Amino acid sequence: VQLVESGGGVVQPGRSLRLSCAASGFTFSSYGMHWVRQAPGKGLEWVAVISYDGSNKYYADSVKGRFTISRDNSKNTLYLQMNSLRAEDTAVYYCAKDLGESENGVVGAFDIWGQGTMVTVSSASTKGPSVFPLAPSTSGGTAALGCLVKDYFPEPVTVSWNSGALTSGVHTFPAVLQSSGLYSLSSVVTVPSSSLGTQTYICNVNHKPSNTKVDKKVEPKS
Amino acid sequence: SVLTQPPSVSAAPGQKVTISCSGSSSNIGNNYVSWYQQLPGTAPKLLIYENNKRPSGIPDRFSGSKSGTSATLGITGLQTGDEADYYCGTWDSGGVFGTGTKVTVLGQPKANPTVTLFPPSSEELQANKATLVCLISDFYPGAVTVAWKADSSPVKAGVETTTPSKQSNNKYAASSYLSLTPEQWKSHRSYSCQVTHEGSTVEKTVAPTE
């Protein structure tokens, strides 16, 4: 059995998008089909359902109005016609089979799932990264500094420190999808709390797509 | 419409782990329960259906049960390949999933989280924006429940938190942000980062007066 989603890309809120799920390795015409979404990095959220025939159709309240799950048994494809997309509909949509078993629709058990196509709804063009200094406070004998790479878009950002001359003590966290349809991540360096005043520290952020190369000297306060 | 399962359960290799699903009769009681595994960067996988029944291909060391308003998934002989997000689900006449239970086959002692919270920079306030960055480090297993608190009052807004990732010391690390208006920031004596880990709860705090 194989489920292969399709038609997953970036979209502006309000506009439309229809995901396609090429199903194979089974009948499809005799199993109900589900759609499930998993926003990074939250849990599984049950989206919509369509019966084996296409009669019964059910959605979540967070989706009730604006989505219309359909399906094409001729092509063995499930369709999630998503209209009027919003921000918190951004998720990894999952084509999921239903397990209708044991004789005399249908039921809620998903034996097989698809790879899942990521939909990133965002009213946003390529935004350059705004970088902010995470000036230390410190929990002896160690202190922490960093750079909040925020309000950037899209997503490949590369951060370094001291132009490559600082690999150890460093930890760059994953990017998060913000409440502005942009992104945010932080870069951190863990150093001796005694070395603060002397050593200069620069986060060398580099958003390649938008062509921005931000550099922020991080130091403590007063 | 919220099925209750703990964020984390964790045993040693070879041991039993059980994951519970408590809720209400309308959700779990009168209905079938189904358990799903999810390795990181993979689609969910069906483990258990109809409370206790099992598919062919699933190792026999995956058990299921339902006693009224409670349902249990067990795992004997724990092996690293069991490290995953386990979700419980159900139907009702689709239905609802669990909060998400992580499983970690302990390869080391529980390390408690080192919390380093950063306030919004004066440079960030010079753009009429503000973000508090809580940075939780060196912890194991990789399951933390971050709550923010304006003064002792709670706060729901601006919260974005990452799914933990293993560092180079094999212990996990994550981060939570708090997107605030500079007025709100300057309108509370202190914001705080409550970090719950394996039952323990750590609180770091900052104030605009710093």
Side-chain angles (χ1 to χ4, degrees), chain A, chain B residues 1-209:
Chain A
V1 178
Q2 309 188 343
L3 298 176
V4 182
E5 290 80 345
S6 169
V10 60
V11 146
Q12 300 82 344
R15 292 212 181 181
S16 311
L17 187 57
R18 176 182 248 218
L19 313 189
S20 320
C21 185
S24 66
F26 62 113
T27 63
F28 193 88
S29 76
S30 300
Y31 292 110
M33 294 300 294
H34 306 255
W35 268 108
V36 172
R37 73 188 187 194
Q38 187 179 31
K42 307 175 184 173
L44 304 177
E45 187 181 18
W46 172 85
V47 179
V49 175
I50 190 165
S51 180
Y52 65 84
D53 48 10
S55 277
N56 298 331
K57 292 179 179 179
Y58 295 113
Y59 314 73
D61 303 19
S62 177
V63 167
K64 179 64 180 308
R66 3 164 289 282
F67 287 8
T68 47
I69 177 172
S70 52
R71 85 186 219 158
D72 197 346
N73 292 335
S74 75
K75 319 190 80 172
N76 279 8
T77 69
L78 181 71
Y79 294 144
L80 185 62
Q81 178 63 52
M82 304 160 49
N83 298 291
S84 180
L85 308 203
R86 310 182 194 175
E88 282 182 6
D89 308 329
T90 287
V92 188
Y93 285 79
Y94 279 104
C95 183
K97 173 188 160 182
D98 183 33
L99 176 62
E101 196 177 286
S102 292
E103 318 154 33
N104 306 341
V106 211
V107 49
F110 330 106
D111 45 323
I112 275 71
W113 300 60
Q115 51 179 66
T117 44
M118 177 52 158
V119 180
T120 307
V121 185
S122 52
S123 70
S125 64
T126 170
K127 182 71 191 69
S130 306
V131 181
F132 299 117
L134 304 172
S137 172
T138 64
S139 90
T142 175
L145 63 98
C147 292
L148 177 62
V149 177
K150 193 178 75 178
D151 292 338
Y152 73 95
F153 187 104
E155 266 263 37
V157 151
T158 115
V159 185
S160 45
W161 288 85
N162 296 19
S163 290
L166 186 48
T167 71
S168 296
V170 189
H171 191 281
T172 311
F173 299 82
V176 72
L177 174 53
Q178 253 191 158
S179 55
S180 59
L182 315 177
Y183 292 95
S184 313
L185 74 88
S186 299
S187 189
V188 158
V189 188
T190 64
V191 298
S193 46
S194 67
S195 67
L196 293 174
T198 306
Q199 277 181 315
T200 179
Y201 282 108
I202 296 169
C203 64
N204 300 122
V205 189
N206 178 208
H207 194 219
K208 251 152 211 183
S210 80
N211 203 5
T212 318
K213 297 184 180 183
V214 194
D215 304 73
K216 275 286 142 162
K217 186 191 300 183
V218 177
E219 355 161 73
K221 294 132 155 170
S222 32
Chain B
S1 178
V2 185
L3 299 185
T4 319
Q5 57 179 208
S8 175
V9 310
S10 76
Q15 299 243 51
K16 180 96 164 185
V17 289
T18 68
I19 303 177
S20 52
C21 251
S22 300
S24 50
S25 62
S26 66
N27 287 347
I28 313 169
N30 300 347
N31 306 283
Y32 282 131
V33 178
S34 306
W35 288 83
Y36 309 85
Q37 188 189 55
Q38 181 172 55
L39 292 303
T42 67
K45 179 188 171 189
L46 184 69
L47 300 179
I48 307 294
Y49 63 100
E50 298 194 29
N51 304 334
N52 51 21
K53 305 171 87 170
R54 182 164 69 78
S56 44
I58 298 294
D60 50 322
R61 60 188 192 85
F62 282 117
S63 82
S65 86
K66 191 194 87 185
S67 60
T69 184
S70 58
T72 299
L73 170 96
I75 317 172
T76 61
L78 212 64
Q79 46 165 212
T80 311
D82 290 330
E83 292 205 49
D85 298 278
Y86 293 81
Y87 298 94
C88 83
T90 171
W91 194 63
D92 165 47
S93 175
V96 64
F97 282 100
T99 50
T101 302
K102 186 173 195 181
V103 174
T104 305
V105 197
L106 265 76
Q108 69 190 109
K110 285 183 180 177
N112 297 97
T114 316
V115 181
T116 300
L117 180 60
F118 284 111
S121 57
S122 58
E123 176 165 18
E124 183 176 353
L125 301 176
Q126 284 157 18
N128 197 256
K129 312 216 77 188
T131 313
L132 282 69
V133 190
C134 206
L135 302 163
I136 304 107
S137 319
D138 297 316
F139 64 89
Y140 188 97
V144 300
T145 296
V146 184
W148 289 92
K149 265 189 169 178
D151 304 318
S152 288
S153 318
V155 57
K156 311 166 184 175
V159 190
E160 312 288 4
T161 309
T162 72
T163 299
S165 66
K166 182 193 289 190
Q167 308 162 234
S168 55
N169 65 345
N170 260 268
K171 284 182 263 163
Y172 297 76
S175 59
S176 67
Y177 302 85
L178 189 68
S179 301
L180 295 178
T181 71
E183 304 89 56
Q184 287 159 348
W185 169 243
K186 295 175 226 166
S187 293
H188 290 282
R189 306 206 176 184
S190 107
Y191 272 86
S192 306
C193 189
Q194 261 186 326
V195 188
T196 315
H197 177 235
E198 294 292 328
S200 63
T201 311
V202 189
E203 179 181 86
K204 274 288 179 180
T205 82
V206 208
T209 69

